[PDB]
RNA sequence: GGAUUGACAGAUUGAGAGCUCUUUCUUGAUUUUGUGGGUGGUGGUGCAUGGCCGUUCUUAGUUGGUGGAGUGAUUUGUCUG
């Protein structure tokens, strides 16, 4: 189980997340969502 | 098991440029590219045009209808004062 959830304002907890090592970050929250959940 | 944008911060780069990376998701086919066509084009010729303007040019000039002169190009009318 990998690649956990965002705080995406568009839909409530409903995306997978494009993440490097040691972070957690959405694929459309490109200008927002600094803290990795 | 996404044609492709773009992804915090760290050397960048006008900065939150994923421009390039240290690298993985979404609205989902509307285009990564294979011809053939305008293209942004102000880099294209006003020597192919319009339209406009300037000029010839604050000067007095121009033409056709009848008839005359000349075979005719053309003159006359449009003039000596
Ligand atoms: Zn979403």
Contacts 24+ apart (CB under 8 A), A11-16: none
Experimental method: cryo-EM
- Is residue A1's beta carbon less than 7 angstroms from any atom in nucleic acid strand B? no
Residue A13 tokens, joined: 């907890």
- Is residue A6's beta carbon less than 7 angstroms from any atom in nucleic acid strand B? no
CA of A21 to C1' of B69 (A): 114
CA of A1 to C1' of B12 (A): 34
Residue A20 tokens, joined: 């490097």
Q: Among all chains, which residue has been given the structure tokens 């568009």?
A: A10
Resolution value, angstrom units: 3.9
CA distance to A15, A19, A26, A32, per residue, from A9 (Å): 11, 18, 11, 10
Report the sign of the C-alpha dihedral through residues A10, A14, A17, A22, in that order.
positive
- Is residue A9's beta carbon less than 7 angstroms from any atom in nucleic acid strand B? no
Q: Could you give the CA distance from residue A17 to residue A19 in angstroms, rounded to a whole number?
A: 6
Dump the DSSP string for A1-37: --S-----SSSTT---B---TT---BSS-TTS--S--
Q: Could you give the CA distance from residue A1 to residue A28 in angstroms, rounded to a whole number?
A: 22
């Amino acid at each position: 189980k990998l690649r956990r959830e965002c705080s995406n304002p568009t839909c409530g907890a409903g995306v997978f997340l494009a993440n490097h090592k040691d972070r957690l970050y959405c694929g459309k929250c490109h200008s927002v969502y600094k803290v990795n959940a």
